[PDB]
Antibody, heavy 208, light 212 residues
Framework: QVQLVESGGGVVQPGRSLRLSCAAS????????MHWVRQAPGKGLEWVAV????????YYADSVKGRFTISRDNSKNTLYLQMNSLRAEDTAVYYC???????????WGQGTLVTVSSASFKGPSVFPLATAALGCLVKDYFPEPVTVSWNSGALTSGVHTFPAVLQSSGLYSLSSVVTVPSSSLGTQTYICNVNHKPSNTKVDKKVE | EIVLTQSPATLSLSPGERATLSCRAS??????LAWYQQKPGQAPRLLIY???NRATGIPARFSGSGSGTDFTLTISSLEPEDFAVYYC??????????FGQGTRLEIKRTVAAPSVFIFPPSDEQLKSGTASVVCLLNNFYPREAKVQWKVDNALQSGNSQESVTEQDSKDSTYSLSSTLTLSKADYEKHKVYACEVTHQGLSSPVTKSFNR
């Protein structure tokens, strides 16, 4: 009934610290050995570290060493990642995995996201984008993520909500679009509903 | 350090087709080769362990072969389920443990032309001393396209950002947004504003444009 749940991520400043956790249920945590793997945005898999049995043995990937420490409380069933000296590039979903009985990653968790920025928490501005296309421009926000809706969720159809760009700034920008009958349009009202929770920011934008 | 190579990057296939996936080692990794499935915004899952073995809960459509430097991933008939990202990984020589870069499995479809839209900067942005120029690429196939920015016929590099959608679950389409970033001041100085779209299914390339 094998479960793994990671916790602990965060926005974090370059130079600093962050601890991650991995709660195991379902198996002999204590018989296994464990890894951490990491997944930058737009990007592939990257093995980070391994811990034994026993705690005795700990391997680290090169890009991490001296910064990161791997550890383990056996007896609250839990795996740990200590991340010192954080840089920009350490931004990644962090997965914990079970070693088999190896070098084999049997069970993974769902991951936890680590964002490494000197940038300041912010809400977006919400600009209008006026066979027809329309949408909203979601500028200059930090951090991820953000939600878009059209007409309170009643518009679904012909919707494209595009992935965010990072910003030189270190702010996010984005777009949601919709296509519609040019017909409609006189006459049908369009409102993009923007939620940016880590700022407690909600915007409703009529586009016309 | 073993280098793992995945070929191709992208596999473009229909459902019901046989799927065949490749992984090359840089030296022999013997029989120590794994395969991993990652569906979108989920984590990795184990398919094949040690070339040839099915993982629990893993259906029989899934198969592998090889030895040494040479590896294969076999799917027999594609479920739509299966249009995903697939990674290989060695446990022969570590640390480091290494991964393949991924193959992605795309839905193959008929070639679709973009759908082209230009957006001038808003009114309201104009004040923040903002200006974004927006160009839309609608529902197109395959994924490769090319945007060109132009301002009073000067073409723009380094000033731009672009995004792409996931594959359309009904359409099997891709969409793209391009953002042109720009001073208010610059904005004002200039007249002609232009998005140039180059794609496989256009005879010629398309240009959407506006006068400020």
């Amino acid at each position: 009934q094998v479960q793994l749940v990671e916790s602990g991520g965060g926005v974090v400043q370059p130079g600093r610290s962050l601890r991650l956790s991995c709660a195991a249920s379902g198996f002999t945590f204590s018989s296994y050995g464990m890894h951490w793997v990491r997944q930058a945005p737009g990007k592939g898999l990257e093995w980070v570290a391994v811990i034994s049995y026993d705690g005795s043995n700990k391997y680290y990937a090169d890009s991490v060493k001296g910064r990161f420490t791997i550890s383990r409380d056996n007896s609250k069933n839990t795996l740990y990642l200590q991340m010192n000296s954080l840089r920009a590039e350490d931004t990644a979903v962090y997965y914990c995995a079970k070693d088999g009985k190896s070098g084999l990653l049997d069970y993974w968790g769902q991951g936890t996201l680590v964002t490494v920025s000197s940038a300041s928490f912010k809400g977006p501005s919400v600009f209008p984008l006026a066979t027809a296309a329309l949408g909203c421009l979601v500028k200059d926000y930090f951090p991820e993520p953000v939600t878009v809706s059209w007409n309170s969720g009643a518009l679904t159809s012909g919707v494209h909500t595009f992935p965010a760009v990072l910003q030189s700034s270190g702010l996010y920008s984005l777009s949601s679009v919709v296509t519609v009958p040019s017909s409609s349009l006189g006459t049908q009202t369009y409102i993009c509903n923007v939620n940016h929770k880590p700022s407690n920011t909600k915007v409703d934008k009529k586009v016309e | 350090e073993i280098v793992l190579t995945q070929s191709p990057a992208t596999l473009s296939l229909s459902p019901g087709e046989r799927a065949t996936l490749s992984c090359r080692a840089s030296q022999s990794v013997s029989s120590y080769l794994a395969w991993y499935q990652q569906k979108p915004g989920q984590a990795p899952r184990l398919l094949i362990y040690d070339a040839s073995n099915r993982a629990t809960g893993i259906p029989a459509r899934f198969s592998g072969s090889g030895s040494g430097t040479d590896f294969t991933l076999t799917i027999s008939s594609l479920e739509p389920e299966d249009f995903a990202v697939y990674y290989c990984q060695q446990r022969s020589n570590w640390p480091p443990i290494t991964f393949g870069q991924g193959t992605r499995l795309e839905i193959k479809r008929t070639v679709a032309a973009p759908s082209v839209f230009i957006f001038p900067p808003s009114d309201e942005q104009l004040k923040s001393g903002t200006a974004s120029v927006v160009c839309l690429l609608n529902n197109f196939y395959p994924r490769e396209a090319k945007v060109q920015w132009k301002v009073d016929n000067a073409l723009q590099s380094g000033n731009s950002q672009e995004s792409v959608t996931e594959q359309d679950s009904k359409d099997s389409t891709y969409s793209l947004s391009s953002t042109l970033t720009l001073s208010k001041a610059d904005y004002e100085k200039h007249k002609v504003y232009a998005c140039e779209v180059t794609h496989q299914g256009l005879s010629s390339p398309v240009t959407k444009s506006f006068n400020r």
